[PDB]
Amino acid sequence: ETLGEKWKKKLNQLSRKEFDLYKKSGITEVDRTEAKEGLKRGETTHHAVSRGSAKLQWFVERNMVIPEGRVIDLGCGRGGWSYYCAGLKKVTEVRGYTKGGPGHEEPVPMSTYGWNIVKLMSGKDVFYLPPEKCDTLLCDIGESSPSPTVEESRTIRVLKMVEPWLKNNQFCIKVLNPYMPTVIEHLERLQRKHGGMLVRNPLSRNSTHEMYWISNGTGNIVSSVNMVSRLLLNRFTMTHRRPTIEKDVDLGAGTRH
């Protein structure tokens, strides 16, 4: 049994109180108060539509994925990754796909900087989408469950779905459950063919073991995964540490050339 699986069982043992104290212990998170207030008033400039704009920003500002050209955003939800990429100088097109409907977030229209190169499309199940030419492949799909075997299957399905989109392009792909042995085997095969590394984002909650497979990096996958399981296990053992609060992103306004 893996370190990750032991973490999961401990997480499933927690009360809602213990869980709520645990999920943010020691993490980093952005302050959404201003954005939530302005979005509630219908403002369409400056605000990120979700915490996701800041999450992708963390990887980009570290050169782990460098978005360029035609960007595909699989599972875009409200659009936080798509709107963020739309303001980056090398990006020329952003196409987001998400399921919508009951249980799922719908794209939110915005006029943040570069909005004119974004098209977000709801009613799209990516597991039925034919792959398209693109220079950056982004994917943030993976629903948590209390069952890690369910999570194993959802993770493997995503990795099998993304591979035909990958053709010597930039990428950032969520790996919901990276500690199950079968997932490891797949990731190791994928890194051999397409390179990259798995990376833990500091803005991810302790309630998920998600890691992101990014195109610009090298490293040992098993080692990076076990380090996260050790980190998440250690955070059970202490009284809640309040999260390191950071400033949310300002996505600006206006068209781009």
The annotation places the binding site at 50, 80-81, 98-99, 104-105, 125-126, 212
- Longest alpha-carbon distance in the chain: 53
Q: How far apart are CA 107 and CA 137, in angstroms?
A: 18
> Which residues carry a binding-site annotation for S-adenosyl-L-methionine?
50, 80-81, 98-99, 105, 125-126, 212
Residue 96 binds ligand SAM, judged by CB under 6 A: no
Q: Which is nearer to ligand SAM, 51 or 240 (CB)?
A: 51
CB of 54 to ligand SAM, least distance (A): 9
- Whole-angstrom CA distances from 60 to 73, 85, 195, 211, 241 are 15, 9, 17, 15, 27
Pair of tokens at residue 112:
């943040």
Among 30, 65, 126, 156, binds ligand SAM (CB under 6 A): 126
- Whole-angstrom CA distances from 78 to 50, 61, 103, 120, 156 are 7, 22, 13, 9, 24
Residue 127 binds ligand SAM, judged by CB under 6 A: yes
Among 7, 85, 105, 204, binds ligand SAM (CB under 6 A): 105
Contacting residues for 65 by C-beta, under 8 A, at least 6 apart: 56, 59, 136, 138, 170, 171, 172, 214, 215, 216
Q: What is the three-class DSSP state of 188?
A: helix
Q: How far apart are CA 199 and CA 221, in angstroms?
A: 9
Q: Which is nearer to ligand SAM, 154 or 256 (CB)?
A: 154
Q: Which residue is nearest to ligand SAM (CB)?
A: 52
CB of 223 to ligand SAM, least distance (A): 26
Q: Which is nearer to ligand SAM, 45 or 226 (CB)?
A: 45
Q: Which is nearer to ligand SAM, 153 or 226 (CB)?
A: 153
CB of 125 to ligand SAM, least distance (A): 4
Contacting residues for 25 by C-beta, under 8 A, at least 6 apart: 206, 235, 238, 240, 241, 243
Among 23, 24, 32, 104, binds ligand SAM (CB under 6 A): 104
Q: Which is nearer to ligand SAM, 197 or 203 (CB)?
A: 203
Q: How far apart are CA 224 and CA 172, in angstroms?
A: 16
Interacting positions 30-89 with ligand SAM (CB under 6 A): 50, 52-53, 75-81
DSSP category for residue 254? S
Residue ranges in contact with ligand SAM by CB under 6 A: 50, 52-53, 75-81, 98-99, 104-105, 124-127, 140-141
